[PDB]
Design a protein around this ligand. Structure first.
Ligand SMILES: NC(=O)c1ccc[n+]([C@@H]2O[C@H](COP(=O)([O-])OP(=O)(O)OC[C@H]3O[C@@H](n4cnc5c(N)ncnc54)[C@H](O)[C@@H]3O)[C@@H](O)[C@H]2O)c1
Ligand SMILES: NC(=O)c1ccc[n+]([C@@H]2O[C@H](COP(=O)([O-])OP(=O)(O)OC[C@H]3O[C@@H](n4cnc5c(N)ncnc54)[C@H](O)[C@@H]3O)[C@@H](O)[C@H]2O)c1
Ligand SMILES: NC(=O)c1ccc[n+]([C@@H]2O[C@H](COP(=O)([O-])OP(=O)(O)OC[C@H]3O[C@@H](n4cnc5c(N)ncnc54)[C@H](O)[C@@H]3O)[C@@H](O)[C@H]2O)c1
Ligand SMILES: NC(=O)c1ccc[n+]([C@@H]2O[C@H](COP(=O)([O-])OP(=O)(O)OC[C@H]3O[C@@H](n4cnc5c(N)ncnc54)[C@H](O)[C@@H]3O)[C@@H](O)[C@H]2O)c1
Ligand SMILES: O=C(NCc1cccnc1)NC1CCCCC1
Ligand SMILES: O=C(NCc1cccnc1)NC1CCCCC1
Ligand SMILES: O=C(NCc1cccnc1)NC1CCCCC1
Ligand SMILES: O=C(NCc1cccnc1)NC1CCCCC1
Lengths: 267, 267, 267, 267
């Protein structure tokens, strides 16, 4: 297996469509011993994760909760056994109130909402790193889920801003991570039809935003030289695993594009 | 004059070393009729602005204050006279608590501090745009002060993250601004020895951070093909005015580097 | 005038639709004393340039001709009068054989053709700089015409490669230029319907390439927050003049986008 | 093994210090069945490649020779056996005459020399792709060796320009490659002390260029969060193999930085 004998912490599972669910599945297929972290609906995350190729301890983590982060390292160690450390940390956490995404005009998102979104979607990449780096082995790897925010786009609005902030956070996490011999990087993925994304397209955040995001998401497979199948997280999950492996040993504070090459193409 | 008959709102003056003080001065030398906005210490801002080539009404603006922003357009109109609009808006506002910059480890900045910093340094670019765009003329221009955050650097820490967020904000402000026939852009300046910057170099945010920033700032004049004089904001102030003028009519959601070309050079 | 008392060399005029014809016109409207350089069809360039707001000496320059480049400085001095130097140099020169652009598959362009294209479109930016920098004044400016090649696009093929090379050349010209106190920069313009571009759209380099370029060119005005009118070089010509002026004094080895902001927008 | 049952063509071996020698070695350690291509000194390349973990047929390829490229696919098929195709193609070919690199002023490189350099270092990435894509399997991979040319640097001069051109070429090769279900990407490596690089540092292309390149190369390990050991190609060779594998399935027309993260850091 690619990740044989590796202890990897995988955050972000909420449904069977979560990118993290596919990251977890592939890493287990590649021999990783995982520890999962869930938020709020833990009875659901447990039931969802029962479908993973193997059993993995589930720990609760609200990245906005300062006690959860402080108690994280200890709780992780209790699950993996004393004397054992993590080799991989996967941040697949993202959130933005409806004021920040969708139909709501960009100027109408109040700061308290944008702040909540940058805390969960960007600051938490450094929060997780702080907590987990003392219990990470040299050669270890932190991977975060990004969406290319280099250019503005319709509807994605403040969530775009949170991604720009996260790409900056990552470059700084890399500086700290490196002192522990650990790499920190992001995977900028093409659009993936998660339950939330599907709802949006179906008009959950308004019709105008839904049409904008359906058009936006169709432009990937057109630009992408090798195509883009938005109903398939496996190519994304495989890239995350390439970064958790020992095959990208000189890459840190960087972004790897699992987007079918669509970002390299104008038309 | 370059800005002849132009009504430009200039925010950010605090001392005679402020980049905004030099933006104000050059714009007045180029024939602009200005309206200034100050924060907290208004008796000081008035006394400092008495040294500008001409008189300009000073209005109070705490970008974190929702009433100031709501009352802004009306107060600006009262100063410029009803029936008159703004042609230019200058955002030269930035702030980050000491936990976010300096010696304090990157992981030790609490979110409430980083959030305060992203609100004042990034979100406020959209707050100002919202307020002022209804009272801006077609062909108008919004300019913001940026510091190239494309790569991580010592000590600048979370303020780097706030700049990355601001560059993203700008791309989105441009989308809204354009509906009013107004351009929105940033000027990524090289280091300028303001009173605050000088204090930092002198050890205000710790010795380690001071040495890092002195080294950092000396690398500009070495990389820069035309040199970089950090004791001179005039080249920066001139670039801001080029963007307020009618000579960059097809540039929006963009960054203009007034850094001596140092960003284009490795060594 | 913006360029009052400035002596600017303007290359690239071939027809009344040439970007250089509009650069020349605006610079003359802004008070510049110009020297023009033409290639091959000089009787035509003279007749075309008779329509400029003022008279300007026309000099012959085949950038592939080593004698023309060697004799350039002397011939320029003879036209502007001994003791006088240039303040501005405009490179608006570009060429790629049909094998390199259009319908012809990318793999089917022979090297001798691509080489001819990189010589005229990229290397010549350094050739012109070499020749003209000894007869340029401190504070002077070299400006070149670019087309954003950051991402691949249909039909533009090897001409894209020549632009990528030119952006690299510029960064290096800036290093040499700076020793003379002169800035070197490029203007990455949005598509302009020149006679050549119109012919292409009309099927001159094949129907498939024509349709690709018409689609490509229509995407500018859709992405561009302030719009993009491809039948109007005036916004481009104005930007070139902003770089020839004294209002961008700290910008070198850089690119300024006169594209309506379309490069900053995904959709 | 990572590359188990994969047939990979590896170009660029000249000495035991060649990046390609290490790409070959790692790919063989990971189970790849290789075909090597050499230039000019084939008796030497054979003797050097005798030290590879396994035997691999050596084929002659002067990328400037149109017959070699035409006969390539047939010769490769004869070596791997009819009915068998390539899964991987490694371009580790680069060259620039002394006029283009080193002490020689940037303006003093004649075009015939720069052209020779862009042909071998950039155009040949498309030449190899053309030749080998008809004999490549779906899921296949083309990898090229890049050196980050985003910013100008001392001494590297026209070779920088050739890299900028190659990054553009790659984005276009990706468009063609994709029709065959094949990915095309580059690895932008940090400096590697090959025999040629060592000679340069030792004054082979002049003392001024040698000092510039020694200083340049020392800046990597300082910027790089995880460090940079220039006497070790193994991290580079491992990254090339990650791209030849099935673990980066949604990455094409892209660049992967095996530079210790030094490009993500200012200081
Ligand atoms: N879906 C796409 O099109 C797409 C594309 C590229 C990147 N991404 C990114 O991938 C990541 C995963 O998103 P996804 O699309 O799989 O959706 P998702 O809904 O399945 O995952 C997001 C996760 O964030 C968790 N979360 C929210 N608030 C939290 C908090 N306070 N503390 C801890 N966890 C919290 C949720 O429980 C959920 O598990 C996100 O960063 C997203 O921005 C998504
Ligand atoms: N000094 C440098 O080296 C440098 C270089 C490039 C860019 N910049 C940027 O230029 C801008 C101006 O900075 P400066 O260096 O002239 O320093 P400065 O201290 O003179 O200006 C910053 C201004 O922000 C104002 N401000 C702070 N909090 C505010 C709030 N809540 N509401 C309204 N105004 C508020 C302050 O009153 C001050 O006038 C900033 O965005 C800064 O990041 C600075
Ligand atoms: N038209 C567009 O859509 C567009 C957009 C952005 C940038 N550009 C760039 O702007 C520049 C000017 O192009 P244009 O669109 O005005 O077309 P153009 O045909 O009017 O100008 C190109 C010029 O190159 C000259 N030239 C060709 N070979 C030469 C040689 N060997 N020596 C000297 N001069 C030579 C021609 O005489 C002509 O004057 C080019 O660099 C082009 O790539 C064009
Ligand atoms: N050494 C570094 O610091 C460094 C860093 C990053 C990238 N690179 C790149 O890696 C690649 C390999 O370089 P290297 O450093 O291992 O040096 P190298 O000398 O070992 O390899 C270059 C190869 O190019 C071959 N070659 C030259 N002309 C040729 C032609 N006409 N046809 C076919 N092959 C030809 C040579 O035989 C040699 O095998 C190059 O593209 C180089 O630019 C080098
Ligand atoms: O980042 C996300 N999607 C990327 C995207 C953007 C535009 C179009 N298509 C996809 N989604 C996240 C939003 C916050 C909750 C977790 C999921
Ligand atoms: O952005 C600022 N400085 C840029 C910089 C960074 C690193 C080195 N030298 C300069 N300063 C601002 C900080 C917040 C209060 C206003 C000023
Ligand atoms: O650079 C040029 N056009 C840019 C462009 C690309 C794609 C679509 N629309 C416009 N044209 C030049 C070609 C060589 C002769 C001079 C003109
Ligand atoms: O690309 C190469 N080196 C990268 C580099 C640049 C600057 C400093 N250190 C390293 N070298 C190649 C030159 C042409 C022959 C093959 C090797």
């Amino acid at each position: 297996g690619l990740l044989d004998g590796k202890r990897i912490l995988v955050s972000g599972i909420i449904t069977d469509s979560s990118i993290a669910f596919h990251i977890a599945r592939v890493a287990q297929e590649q021999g990783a011993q995982l520890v999962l972290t869930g938020f709020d609906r833990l009875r659901l995350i447990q039931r969802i994760t029962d479908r993973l190729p193997a059993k993995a301890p589930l720990l609760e983590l609200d990245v906005q909760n300062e006690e959860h982060l402080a108690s994280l390292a200890g709780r992780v160690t209790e699950a993996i056994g004393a004397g054992n450390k993590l080799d991989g940390v996967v941040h697949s956490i993202g959130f933005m109130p409806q004021t920040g995404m969708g139909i709501n005009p960009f100027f109408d998102a109040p700061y308290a909402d944008v702040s909540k979104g940058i805390h969960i979607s960007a600051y938490s990449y450094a929060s997780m790193a702080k907590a987990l780096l003392p219990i990470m082995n040299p050669g270890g790897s932190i991977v975060g889920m990004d969406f290319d925010p280099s250019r503005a786009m319709p509807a994605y609005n403040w969530m775009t801003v949170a991604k720009s902030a996260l790409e900056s956070v990552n470059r700084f996490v890399a500086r700290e991570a490196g002192k522990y011999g650990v790499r920190s990087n992001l995977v900028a993925a093409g659009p993936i039809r998660t339950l939330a994304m599907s709802a949006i397209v179906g008009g959950a955040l308004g019709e105008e935003a839904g049409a904008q995001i359906q058009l936006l998401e169709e432009g990937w497979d057109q630009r992408a030289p090798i195509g883009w199948n938005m109903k398939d997280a496996t190519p994304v999950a495989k890239t995350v695993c390439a970064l958790l492996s020992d095959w990208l040993p000189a890459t840190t504070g960087d972004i790897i594009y699992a987007d079918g090459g669509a970002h390299t193409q104008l038309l």
